[PDB]
Structure formats: C-alpha cells, structure tokens
Design an enzyme around this catalytic site. Structure first.
Site, short mmCIF file in Angstrom:
data_model
loop_
_atom_site.label_atom_id
_atom_site.label_comp_id
_atom_site.label_asym_id
_atom_site.label_seq_id
_atom_site.Cartn_x
_atom_site.Cartn_y
_atom_site.Cartn_z
N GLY A 17 17.71 7.07 31.57
CA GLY A 17 18.84 7.75 30.87
C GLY A 17 20.12 7.92 31.68
O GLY A 17 20.22 7.42 32.81
N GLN A 18 27.64 11.08 32.60
CA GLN A 18 28.36 12.25 33.12
C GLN A 18 27.83 12.67 34.51
O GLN A 18 28.50 12.44 35.53
CB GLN A 18 28.28 13.41 32.12
N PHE A 19 26.65 13.30 34.54
CA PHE A 19 26.01 13.72 35.81
C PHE A 19 25.60 12.52 36.67
O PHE A 19 25.65 12.59 37.91
CB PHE A 19 24.78 14.59 35.53
N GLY A 20 25.19 11.43 36.01
CA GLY A 20 24.74 10.21 36.68
C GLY A 20 23.48 9.65 36.03
O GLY A 20 23.16 10.00 34.90
N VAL A 21 22.75 8.80 36.75
CA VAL A 21 21.57 8.11 36.22
C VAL A 21 20.24 8.70 36.68
O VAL A 21 20.12 9.17 37.82
CB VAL A 21 21.52 6.64 36.74
CG1 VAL A 21 20.63 5.76 35.83
CG2 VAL A 21 22.91 6.08 36.91
N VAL A 22 19.23 8.63 35.82
CA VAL A 22 17.88 8.99 36.21
C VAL A 22 17.01 7.76 36.25
O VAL A 22 17.05 6.93 35.38
CB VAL A 22 17.20 9.96 35.25
CG1 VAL A 22 15.89 10.47 35.88
CG2 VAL A 22 18.12 11.13 34.90
N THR A 80 12.52 15.14 41.00
CA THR A 80 11.60 16.02 40.23
C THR A 80 10.34 15.33 39.78
O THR A 80 10.21 14.09 39.86
CB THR A 80 12.23 16.45 38.93
OG1 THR A 80 12.29 15.31 38.06
CG2 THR A 80 13.63 16.92 39.17
N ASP A 127 22.94 26.87 30.75
CA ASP A 127 23.18 25.81 29.72
C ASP A 127 21.89 25.43 29.00
O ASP A 127 21.53 24.27 28.90
CB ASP A 127 23.79 24.60 30.35
CG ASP A 127 24.42 23.67 29.31
OD1 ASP A 127 24.37 23.98 28.09
OD2 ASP A 127 24.95 22.64 29.73
C1 LIG Z 1 18.73 14.44 25.79
C2 LIG Z 1 19.64 13.93 26.62
C3 LIG Z 1 19.28 12.91 27.63
O1 LIG Z 1 19.25 11.72 27.32
N1 LIG Z 1 18.99 13.29 28.91
C4 LIG Z 1 18.66 12.30 29.94
C5 LIG Z 1 19.27 12.78 31.29
C6 LIG Z 1 18.08 13.42 32.01
N2 LIG Z 1 17.05 12.42 31.67
C7 LIG Z 1 15.79 12.59 32.25
C8 LIG Z 1 14.65 11.96 31.68
C9 LIG Z 1 13.45 12.12 32.31
C10 LIG Z 1 13.38 12.89 33.50
C11 LIG Z 1 12.09 13.13 34.16
N3 LIG Z 1 11.88 14.17 34.98
O2 LIG Z 1 11.17 12.41 33.90
C12 LIG Z 1 14.56 13.46 34.01
O3 LIG Z 1 14.46 14.16 35.17
C13 LIG Z 1 15.42 14.97 35.73
C14 LIG Z 1 16.21 15.88 34.99
C15 LIG Z 1 17.14 16.66 35.67
C16 LIG Z 1 17.28 16.59 37.06
O4 LIG Z 1 18.17 17.40 37.75
C17 LIG Z 1 17.84 18.74 37.87
C18 LIG Z 1 18.81 19.70 38.16
C19 LIG Z 1 18.47 21.06 38.24
C20 LIG Z 1 17.14 21.45 38.03
C21 LIG Z 1 16.15 20.50 37.73
C22 LIG Z 1 16.51 19.16 37.65
C23 LIG Z 1 16.48 15.70 37.79
C24 LIG Z 1 15.55 14.90 37.13
N4 LIG Z 1 15.71 13.27 33.39
C25 LIG Z 1 17.13 12.20 30.21
#
Ligand SMILES: C=CC(=O)N[C@H]1CCN(c2ccc(C(N)=O)c(Oc3ccc(Oc4ccccc4)cc3)n2)C1
Length: 256
Positions: A17, A18-22, A80, A127
């Site tokens: 998947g 603004q903040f960047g890529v996962v 995470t 948020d």
């Molecule tokens: C619905 C909108 C959408 O498309 N969102 C997309 C953007 C986030 N994407 C995902 C998808 C799967 C995962 C996963 N853990 O498996 C995932 O992990 C993250 C999420 C946040 C993060 O940073 C943090 C900051 C503060 C506290 C905790 C974590 C670090 C890893 N992010 C989907």
C-alpha cells in the site's frame, strides 16, 4: 538501540500500500513483518524517534505491535507485525465477506479494547478511523498509527472530529471517543464514508447545527445507542472507553 533495527536484517518481498510505502518482508530471513518506509521530508523525524521510545513500551493484543525503527537512514523505517488482511476500511468494503452483525460487533470490541488500553496509559490516538485499523489473518482488528499525526509536516479528519475540535482545536480523550463512535458507524455501514453526501465544509456546519450520523441498517437500536452516546455535544457527557467496552459486552451477550 533497544528501539533500533538494523536494515541489513530486513528482506523486502512484496508491496502492501502521503506517509510513504509499506512492504511485507522477513526479519532475519525468518519472521514476517511490515515495513513502512517514510517518504523523505514528510515527517518530523527526530521528534518521532523520541516518541518511538514511549510507543515501544505500549503493548496490547489489539494494538499493532511495533518491532522498531531504522534511524540513521533516509528515509526512516517503521517495523511492525504483519497484518495479512490489510486495512479495515478496505476489508469492510469487500462485499464477499458477508459479515454477520456479531462479526461487526467483535470488530468494534477489538478497537475498543485497544482504545481502553491507550486511555489507561493516557495516550491519545488523535486520528482514529477505519483507515488506520488493520486486520490480521484471523480476522482480528487492531489499532494502528497511534499518535503518528503529531509528526506529519484540507486533508484534516473533519468527519471524525467533534465540535470542540472543529471550532477550537480542543483535543482530549473525548475527541478520541467521538472518533470511535464514527468508526462504529463505518463498520456497521460496511465502510461508507461518513456524511457521504457532504463535503468536509458542509459536515462541519451540519455538526455545529446538531446533525448526527443516521443509524446504519445493520445496527440494532442498542448498537446505535452506543455509537450515538459518543457524539454528545458536551464532551464531558461522552462515555470513557471503559464504559463503551462494558456496553459493547452487554450487547454481545444480549444479541448472541
Ligand atoms: C486503508 C488505507 C490504506 O490503504 N492503508 C495502507 C497504508 C498502511 N498499509 C498497511 C498494510 C498492512 C500493514 C501491516 N502491518 O501488515 C501495514 O503496517 C503498518 C502500518 C502503520 C505503520 O506505522 C505505524 C505508526 C505508528 C504506530 C504503528 C504503526 C507501520 C506499518 N500497513 C495499508
């Protein structure tokens, strides 16, 4: 660093998947993780790094577990646990799941348990919305991105904000409680945008005149009472997450 992960230990495998890529990857060729790479310039990195220390100490089954950060890089990495079913909002929108209302209520309860823990640690989410919750392989919902908006440098969460936030920027536990009610609405509506016919501007004006989100058809009258209680005009009359949790349990028992 107790909060510090060596990027050498990370294998990148697939994009998620603004903040960047996962990305999905493995730690030491062995452990599933997600890797959010922070877009350069987008975040207040030093402040974030200090906060990460506090976040590292937050621990709850319904909170997405932070494993660490890669600092001393550009961009920083946040590591995470992997959540196989991705973001809650998308999950809700997939009509194939054909959810039972008991499964919707359990999603509400997962989030409320996380928010109760954050409240017990005096940590504000700031948020909370279905876009910022994630879903694991067992269908467990967990709260993600907690506190993160503080470090991001017309895209504000108007639709999840109480009147004192819209009018005066008064954030409190009770602005999280408001947002939670709106998240219950999202769930029971299977991922509709709140105030789906209105712009952000209109939504603010309507909230100030006393408008509230309508009862989604999948919500029972008792479930609507709960999300509705989150939207009192007076912050002090909104419940706590501890009260919300007991109310959600009562309904689960009554609608079993
Ligand atoms: C619905 C909108 C959408 O498309 N969102 C997309 C953007 C986030 N994407 C995902 C998808 C799967 C995962 C996963 N853990 O498996 C995932 O992990 C993250 C999420 C946040 C993060 O940073 C943090 C900051 C503060 C506290 C905790 C974590 C670090 C890893 N992010 C989907």
């Amino acid at each position: 660093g107790s909060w510090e992960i060596d990027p050498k230990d990370l294998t990148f495998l697939k994009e998620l998947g603004q903040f960047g890529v996962v990305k999905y990857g493995k730690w030491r060729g062995q452990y599933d993780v997600a890797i959010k790479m922070i877009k350069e310039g987008s975040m207040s990195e030093d402040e974030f790094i200090e906060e990460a220390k506090v976040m590292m100490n937050l621990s709850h089954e319904k909170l997405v577990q932070l494993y660490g950060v890669c600092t001393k890089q550009r961009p920083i990495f946040i590591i995470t646990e992997y959540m196989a079913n991705g973001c809650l909002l998308n999950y809700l929108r997939e009509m194939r799941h054909r959810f039972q209302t008991q499964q919707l209520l359990e999603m509400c309860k997962d989030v409320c348990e996380a928010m109760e823990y954050l409240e017990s640690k005096q940590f504000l989410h700031r948020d909370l919305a279905a876009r910022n919750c994630l879903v694991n392989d067992q269908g467990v919902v967990k709260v993600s991105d907690f506190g993160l908006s503080r470090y991001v440098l017309s895209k504000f969460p108007v639709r999840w904000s109480p009147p004192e936030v819209l009018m005066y920027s008064k954030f409190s536990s009770k602005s999280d409680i408001w947002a939670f009610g709106v998240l219950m609405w999202e769930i029971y509506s299977l991922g509709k945008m709140p105030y789906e016919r209105f712009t952000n501007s209109e939504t603010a004006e309507h909230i100030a005149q006393g408008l509230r989100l309508y009862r989604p058809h999948l919500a029972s009258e008792k479930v609507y009472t709960i999300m509705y209680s989150c939207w009192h005009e007076k912050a002090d009359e909104r419940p706590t997450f501890k009260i919300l949790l007991s109310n959600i349990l009562d309904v689960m028992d009554e609608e079993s």
